[PDB]
């Protein structure tokens, strides 16, 4: 009867086209502002002093870029970790010079993605679902907050944060290799196993369902039209695909249970990306990966090279060349 | 053997401080002898300059500069507490030093709160207290 | 007849004596940078 109850009834209605919910009250204003500023800053945005040395790095399309090289540049080294909104900038020209829109996009992104995650919970509550799709979405939220939030914190500047682009991503990955040795760190190892394993069990499960489909169509029409939507009959012989994989490797390595099978597809990647995103986090605070340089010696004591020493000389090439003007002192403490 | 990692005691010939160490203890045949006069003369020299750094305190409180009085007693005087604790050997010599510290910590506690007389009062409680320290031992 | 959990216990601590032996020789012997 009241105005608030007629508003709570609408905002929590599943009869809307897109469910809004109470998290959409701060998902939609956040992500539309992260979007509408991203499209403008990617297309039309002046160059940005990223190294704090007043050498402005172009990143937008109107200043001679493309899809690959164009990128929303991170904020300055001069700012660093300080909060830099528009009203604390004394003009928009001073805001866009010092890496303004990187903080406006990222902070409205991480609020909107952490609200998109809670929105996946909310609709599962109002639909009668068991709730935990949003726990599986915690794994890219852990990884998005690792390269945009946690790594600028432990390194003390948003300038070490990830550039919102495509070539800026590979500037981020290579400089992160030289300074932290991520490939030898066992948490990037535990998530390469998460996505190689994840793409394995995806294409391994998706093939054994498509292999054992039941005849419901003719050879002229499509294979997919043998599934009517909302039917109650099972659309594939699960005993058939169990007997196949029960002979392809051996018998006891096969899940006859389809529920425990469809749980292992959700376990393996998500655990692999939780562990990986806490690799960037523990390497944000300079707890680097393994270092086996000069580890094998002869009885005389001369250093015998290994593959890690060849990997070290690739890291030394990126270390002596990243931010080639920003350094003045012999050790990259930042 | 050359690359044996957990050879705690069979490796070396001299007895170590602990199996989990590399160093030998503080016993004989050491090159650091703490009874030497140049260690005593180094600790005595910072006690003499401490009074000279402490008489410049009221010149900044006669002026308006409170940032210079908060750090004059930490810029040079950082090496005081390492010495005056080390020179304090006998019984009543030791409980004379905390008279000097509590008088000195109120000079810094008044400089942050910007109290002009409380610096000048507690400065005179410090020159008189180092007078008690140096004249005994 | 032997209970199966006794078999997994003795073999399970046997692996720990194998694994921790391998992490031992990372700090001693060859490949230890001593």
């Amino acid at each position: 009867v009241s105005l608030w109850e007629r508003f709570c009834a609408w905002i929590t209605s599943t009869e809307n086209r897109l469910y809004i919910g109470w998290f959409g009250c701060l998902m939609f204003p956040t992500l539309l502002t992260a979007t509408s500023c991203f499209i403008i800053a990617f297309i039309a945005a002046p160059p940005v002093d990223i190294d704090g040395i007043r050498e402005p790095v172009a990143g937008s399309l109107l200043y001679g870029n493309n899809i690959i090289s164009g990128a929303v540049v991170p904020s300055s080294n001069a700012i660093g970790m300080h909060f830099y909104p528009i009203w604390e900038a004394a003009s928009i020209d001073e805001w866009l010079y010092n890496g303004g829109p990187y903080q406006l996009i990222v902070l409205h992104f991480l609020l909107g993605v952490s609200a998109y995650m809670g929105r996946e919970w909310e609709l599962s509550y109002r639909l009668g679902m068991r709730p935990w799709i949003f726990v599986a979405f915690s794994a890219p939220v852990a990884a998005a907050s690792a390269v945009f939030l946690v790594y600028p914190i432990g390194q003390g500047s948003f300038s070490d944060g990830m550039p919102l682009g495509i070539s800026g991503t590979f500037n981020f990955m290579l400089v992160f290799q030289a300074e932290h040795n991520i490939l030898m760190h066992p948490f990037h190892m535990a998530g390469v196993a998460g996505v190689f394993g994840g793409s394995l069990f995806s294409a391994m499960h998706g093939s054994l369902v498509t292999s054992s489909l039941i005849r419901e169509t003719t050879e002229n029409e499509s294979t997919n039209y043998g599934y009517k939507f909302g039917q109650e009959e099972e659309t594939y012989n699960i005993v058939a695909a169990h007997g196949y994989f029960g002979r392809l490797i051996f018998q006891y390595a096969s899940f006859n249970n389809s529920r425990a099978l469809h749980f292992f597809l959700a376990l393996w990647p998500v655990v692999g990306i939780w562990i990986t995103s806490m690799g960037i986090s523990t390497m944000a605070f300079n707890l680097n990966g393994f270092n086996f340089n000069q580890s094998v010696v002869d009885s005389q004591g001369r250093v015998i090279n290994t593959w890690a020493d060849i990997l070290n000389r690739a890291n030394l090439g990126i270390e002596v060349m990243h931010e080639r003007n920003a350094h003045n002192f012999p050790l990259d403490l930042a | 053997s050359y690359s044996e990692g957990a050879a705690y005691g069979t490796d070396q010939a001299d007895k170590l401080y602990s199996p989990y160490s590399v160093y030998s203890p503080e016993g004989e045949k050491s090159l650091y002898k703490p009874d030497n006069a140049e260690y005593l003369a180094r600790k005595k020299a910072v006690l003499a300059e401490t009074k000279n750094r402490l008489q410049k305190i009221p010149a900044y409180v006669d002026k308006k500069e409170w940032f210079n009085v908060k750090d004059e007693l930490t810029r040079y005087m950082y090496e005081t507490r390492g010495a005056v604790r080390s020179l304090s050997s006998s019984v009543t010599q030791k409980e004379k030093a905390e008279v000097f510290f509590r008088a000195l910590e109120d000079t810094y506690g008044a400089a942050t709160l910007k109290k002009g007389d409380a610096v000048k009062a507690s400065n005179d409680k410090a020159i008189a207290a180092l007078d008690a320290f140096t004249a005994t031992l | 007849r032997i209970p199966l959990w006794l078999v997994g216990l003795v073999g399970g601590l046997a692996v720990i004596t194998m694994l921790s032996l391998f992490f031992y020789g990372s700090y001693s012997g060859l490949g230890s940078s001593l």
Binding site: - | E4 | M18, S32
Partner: peptide
């Protein structure tokens, strides 16, 4: 018989682990 199937994989594996434990105690 399956005694040729397992022991083609297990008789080597214990033999190499006899060597990997010996290499922990080899030094310079």
């Amino acid at each position: 018989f399956r005694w040729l199937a397992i022991h083609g994989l297990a008789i080597p594996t214990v033999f190499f682990l006899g060597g990997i434990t010996a290499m922990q105690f080899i030094q310079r």
